[PDB]
Amino acid sequence: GPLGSDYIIKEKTVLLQKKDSEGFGFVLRGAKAQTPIEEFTPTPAFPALQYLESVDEGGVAWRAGLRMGDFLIEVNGQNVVKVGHRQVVNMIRQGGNTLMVKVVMVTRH
Ligand SMILES: CC(C)C[C@H](N)C(=O)O
């Protein structure tokens, strides 16, 4: 609006269960480095450090509703908003064939 940006925030929590011989069907990417010098502070435009750079059409994540550009908020009950990339990758791998994840999709109206 006249006083600042307006956004639509859609929160999606999904349970992904994959087979051994497949991936969850997405590529995770960090939007910024995580340094211990200063905490990442979330904003509506930039709600988390990790996001879905791409999602395989027809894959597990896709069928559950995850989409390219979704920001990762939680992995298996743990907040990942401020967490660096390798650590988040480890947390996801810790679950094996099961991944519970909350994401947010942000659009500017
Ligand atoms: C977070 C990543 C380790 C997920 C992996 N690329 C997969 O599709 O299974």
Author numbering: 651 to 759
The authors write:
As a model β-strand mediated PPI, we use the GKAP/SHANK-PDZ50 which, plays a role in the organization of synaptic protein complexes and has been linked to several neuronal disorders. There are >250 PDZ domains with several therapeutically relevant proteins known to exhibit their function through a PDZ mediated interaction. Class I PDZ domains bind to consensus sequences with a Thr/Ser in the -2 position from the C-terminus, with the C-terminus hydrophobic residue and free carboxylate being the main determinants of affinity. Here, we used dynamic ligation screening to identify peptide-fragment hybrids linked through an acylhydrazone bond, that are able to functionally mimic a β-strand and inhibit its PPI using GKAP/SHANK1 PDZ as a model interaction.
In all hybrids, the hydrazone bond existed in an E configuration with the aromatic ring of the fragment co-planar with the hydrazone. The N terminal glutamate of the wild-type GKAP interacts with R679, thus we anticipated that the carboxylate of the hybrids might reproduce this same interaction. However, the N terminal part of the hybrids showed different binding behaviour in comparison with the wild type sequence. In some cases, we observed multiple conformations of the same compound having different orientations of the fragments relative to the peptide component presumably allowed by the conformational flexibility of the linker region. The more favourable entropy of binding supports the hypothesis that linker flexibility leads to a “fuzzier” mode of interaction (see below) although the carboxylate exhibited a slight preference for interaction with R736 which differs from the wild-type GKAP peptide (see above) and likely arises from a combination of hybrid flexibility and the propensity of R736 to engage in effective charge-reinforced hydrogen-bonding interactions. Although this leads to slight uncertainty about the exact location of the fragments, we hypothesize that the key carboxylic acid moiety moves dynamically across a positively charged patch formed by R679, R736 and R743 on the protein surface, making transient charge-reinforced hydrogen-bonding and cation–π interactions which is also consistent with a more favourable entropy of interaction.
